[PDB]
Design a protein around this ligand. Structure first.
Ligand code: HEC
Length: 304
């Protein structure tokens, strides 16, 4: 029931670029347009203006998809069920440019609900949540530099409850998860590659992206946890019809998360090297990491 704009098109995370130079060649032109679109005059006056700017930005971008991937021998049935439960369609085309499109669409998905009906999220959570998109697109626009944050308009307070708005937020929040998971996997991969090649500035820029994306993921988890609590209250009503359970991500079978955690493993030496070279990113990333891990409680079905 208009829970989210679907299909939600996303590339295969196994094809994400793995170096800063490759990433820049793949996406920096398009990401730069996206950033300029989201920071155009007037875009940041209020949440309604940001939504309008988002929709004008994504309309102004030339499409890049080539329709569904279709037959993918690397995709298990459990992967497919994971994606279908949230309306995800794996789509052929330049994976990093598809990530830019997906980021803009997930942003618009969030802002549609917040513009109409507010948010109960703490302003600092809202800031890091929506700030996750600025971090991602700003870094993709210039991967060799740390992304700089921009202003994020606040949301009004939650309005009157509308039927299954919690499910809309739950589903649209998971679309954000998939964008941030791919973004953080990119950032972690580039950190690993940069450090292996002794590119300390590239490593530092990659780690700065990874931390900002990780803080964005913590905001998204708070957002989804807030929706999940409201969902649980809405399930107290017993139903004569067979009860409809909200979609749930698997973990084992969610490909973007699998790719992310594999990159994070084996980024350990790069984080220690950055520390030894006098970076402050490792310490603050470690904090963001612990906070994001804890905020799984109340969102992911294999926690709590
Ligand atoms: C339920 C499915 C989820 C969702 C919605 C998210 N993740 Fe997260 N996650 C999940 C599991 C089953 C685990 C295993 C933890 C363990 O066995 O100890 C994790 C863990 C992580 C980690 C830690 C990885 C590491 O320590 O090396 C990270 C960084 C992580 N998950 C990230 C993450 C992000 C960024 C998410 C939203 C974009 C997210 N998870 C959601 C299962 C689930």
């Amino acid at each position: 029931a208009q829970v989210a704009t679907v299909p939600f098109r996303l590339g295969r995370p196994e094809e994400l670029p793995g170096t800063l130079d490759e990433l820049r060649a793949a996406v920096s032109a398009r990401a730069g347009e996206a950033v300029r679109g989201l920071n155009r005059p007037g875009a940041r006056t209020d949440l309604a203006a940001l939504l309008a700017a988002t929709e004008r930005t994504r309309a102004a971008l030339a499409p890049v998809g080539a329709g569904p991937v279709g037959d993918d021998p690397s995709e298990s049935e459990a992967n497919r069920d994971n994606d279908l439960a949230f309306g995800i369609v794996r789509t052929r085309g330049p994976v990093a440019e598809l990530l830019v499109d997906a980021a803009l669409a997930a942003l618009a998905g969030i802002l549609e609900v917040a513009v109409d009906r507010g948010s109960d999220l703490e302003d600092a959570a809202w800031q890091r949540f929506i700030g996750g998109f600025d971090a991602l697109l700003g870094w993709l626009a210039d991967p060799h530099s740390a992304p700089r944050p921009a202003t994020v308009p606040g949301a009004g307070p939650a309005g009157p409850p509308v039927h299954q708005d919690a499910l809309r937020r739950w589903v649209r929040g998971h679309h954000v998860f998939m964008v941030l998971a791919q973004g953080c996997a990119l950032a972690t991969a580039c950190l690993r590659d940069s450090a292996a090649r002794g590119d300390l500035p590239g490593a530092e820029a990659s780690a700065a992206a990874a931390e900002a994306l990780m803080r964005g993921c913590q905001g998204a988890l708070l957002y989804a946890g807030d929706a999940n609590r409201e969902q649980y209250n809405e399930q107290i009503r017993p139903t004569l019809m067979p009860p409809v359970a909200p979609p749930k991500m698997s973990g084992l079978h969610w490909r973007d998360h699998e790719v992310l955690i594999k990159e994070l493993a084996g980024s350990r030496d790069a984080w220690e090297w950055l520390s030894a070279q006098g970076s402050e990113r490792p310490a603050t990333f470690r904090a963001a990491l612990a906070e994001t891990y804890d905020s799984h409680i109340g969102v992911c079905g294999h926690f709590v």
